[model samples]
Target: PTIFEERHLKYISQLGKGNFGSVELCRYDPLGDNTGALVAVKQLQGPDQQRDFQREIQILKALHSDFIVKYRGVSYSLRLVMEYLPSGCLRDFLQRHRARLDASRLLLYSSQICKGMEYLGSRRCVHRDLAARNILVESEAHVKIADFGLAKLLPLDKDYYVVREPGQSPIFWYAPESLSDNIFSRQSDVWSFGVVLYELFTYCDKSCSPSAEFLRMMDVPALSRLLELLEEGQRLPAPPACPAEVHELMKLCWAPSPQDRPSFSALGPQLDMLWS
Candidate 1:
């Protein structure tokens, strides 16, 4: 690995903000192979949140997959340097190019996300925050999984990460078990993937708003109503032109029991079949 220095990095602009930190666009002028490389530097905002950066870097440093964002390195200032995808995030891309989007492209991105999730699961990493907004578009057919702030690493003997204490979560993307029992595992991540699939098939229509509906539903105090809705099997509807098969996969991911959810490996073939 090439040693990254502060002098080699030139700040360009702020990209986006997240639950724990913000990402800044930077120009990396390292003397090695990556000379004049564009990168995203994630800067942590609070002292108490240093563990967020530590765990994220630890996960990113060892994990390698074509469909996941590459971890470039870290700076002395505790900023994380990552490969930058200037093409923007999936949600923004869908919203901006809805007219040009098609089923093949959506399925293509879906397969890539599935492959990435499959690899993450193999590595025992659960991306608790899997969503379109956290996915970056590298090109027309390429999407890389990004963000690990809420991601958890499972123990060699354990399959799930149980929540010992309450904290913030992307509730809409969570599974019924996650919502009701505070349990998180690869299956729950599958639920988030299902929501991402919904976001994709709908081209993230600002009006139909699947996430926004859950957001609105949770606007009031108690989650009893939300859990009740889930308990009764109420799910986000498939939008117009979305193939019935793909929507079926969404429902599979939303299965009441995590054991009933389809594996990413299995979902990959389904997306590939639809892409053709």
Candidate 2:
């Protein structure tokens, strides 16, 4: 369903702000339906944002999976409606409940994300941005991949390429190919997933800066030094809380060659075996 105006949705409250616009908690009741559904509505703010908004809509329309956030609709009001996960995002959840987390719970969350990525891989979609902050948690057992603004569908003939003009790619989470050449693929998402694993294991204090420990692991504030190390094939240190088995998987995902990184389909079964 598509909505052309705000009138189509009843404003419940503001959820939060996004990179390109504001997000709101909304209630949508179709013209003939008695029961309404809760949704997260993202309102685009810039005049030049329509093209990207449409692109995202097209991408979401082409993709579908329980592991991925459900696309509710696109409002004529220039808002994108999506399923609302009241349990918040992965990063926030970990920060809030890290102290009580155990290996079993971490494995559960990891498995869901792996399944989601495997689905995306099969669809030829490159989730340019895959991180804890971008993954939504519905509960202890349900995790859904979200935030597709940076996602790209690879051309049938193309497997590796760089962005025309790379923007601010996350230095810590990006793969070597992406960091140096802007090359991105499903494998790049695998690399980012490894960083997210570090995040899940080394969950930080919500009251303190979340990046503090992660930044310290890098040991270099200078961008030049950071890039030099990456060019020399250095990967981020394993999280203190990570198990040796999972830590080895993180290393595999961070392999210098993108071709060496395991596909999500391969990763899913390995995780199941490791956690089983």
Candidate 3:
């Protein structure tokens, strides 16, 4: 339970990079023998980053959910160790399996995400940023929410955040209130989840190219049009393959009024019913 960097961890190779820092694949060995546990280590550079890293550590320590990634501990060199998943992030996984990605798989992933967000909601926390890229796949169908750098622990009475770190947020994933008036809440996370669901249901075509389409979806002009359309109380077109029920849920999540959006608790069972 003590937060100390154990020296026996051996860095294996670079896993992937993120906005905050690079994460390396590692092996944790308490006895220094050859036996060790595979893990991922994220390096936190500079004073500001270290502070943010510490906050994430605190949050993860208090949080407990199967849908969330496990935090092992920290290092003397300002590094944080976490559960290592071989399948990579959801975005990449979708890209690799897009041609064969099916509704059952999509529902499975979406349900898991809902469970994780529901846990966060109970703790009065806002993810601020929720997307496929921030979700790590543990197996063929399992995923855990990762990257809590932008997470916020809200007060009991406060249900919203007046956006302070606009530069750090993904505009396309942001709720209208978060973008138009700097307001963020768990409701905003719902909006982002809707966008992820859209990506899941629609963009998994091998011929479409996830990279190019992702860029186009997040482009300034595209986001501006999206915002404009949403402000007029018009919802975006549902993915061609989207199930009617799922599309309705997506529209509910993207409701113009944040209060109109359903909570993850409500969203969870609906997702389950889709594949049940």
What is the per-residue lDDT of model 1 for residues 1-276, given as tens digits with 9 covering 90 to 100?
434688888888999888768999988876644568799998887554897678888899888999999988898747888999989899999999899978989999999999999999999999988888899999988999998878889999999988866447656777877777889999988988999999999898877766577656445444666778889888888877889998999999999898999999889888888888
lDDT value, residue 23 of candidate 2 = 80
Model 1 whole-model lDDT (C-alpha atoms) = 0.86
Best by lDDT: 1
lDDT string for model 2 (173-234, tens) is 77777766788988889988887777777763432222454355355454555557666776
Give the runs in model 2 whose Cα sits over 4 Å from its true position.
1-5, 29-36, 46-48, 204-210, 217-221
Overall local distance difference test of candidate 3:
0.79
Stretches of model 1 off by over 4 angstroms after superposition:
30-35, 46-48, 215-222
Instruction: State every prediction's TM-score relative to the real structure.
Output: 0.92, 0.88, 0.86
The sequence of per-residue lDDT tens digits that candidate 3 reaches over residues 172-210 is 677888877878789989988988788777644433333
lDDT of 3 at 248: 90
Better of 1 and 2 by lDDT: 1
RMSD of 3: 3.0
